[PDB]
């Protein structure tokens, strides 16, 4: 319930939701599985540098 909630807190920019979820605590060792990091970099904007 908290895991996929922080994804949309990260993929959509929304940093104030990120501080809330970490305040209620996530794993970050079961959250930062390398699929989700590649998922995180996949939401970079297309016309970026």
């Amino acid at each position: 319930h908290l895991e996929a909630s922080l994804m949309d807190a990260l993929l959509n920019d929304r940093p104030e939701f990120v501080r809330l979820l970490i305040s209620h605590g996530l794993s970050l060792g079961h959250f930062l599985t390398p699929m989700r990091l590649a998922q995180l970099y996949s939401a970079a904007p297309s016309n970026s540098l």
Binding site: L20, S23, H24, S27, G29, H30
Partner: protein, 50 residues
């Protein structure tokens, strides 16, 4: 999280050893590990509380 300033209140959870079920058996040399506990990994909820 309510008061965002806070002072990070301190609370000692005096527990018995023979109840914690996900005991990683912290490092027998001198007990100095930063060793992380495994939290949600349990199908049991019996007399084996974390």
């Amino acid at each position: 999280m309510a008061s965002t300033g806070g002072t990070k209140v301190v609370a000692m959870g005096v527990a018995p050893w023979g109840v914690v079920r996900n005991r990683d058996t912290l490092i027998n040399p001198k007990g100095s590990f930063p060793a992380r506990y495994r939290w949600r990994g349990d199908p049991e909820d019996g007399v084996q509380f974390p």
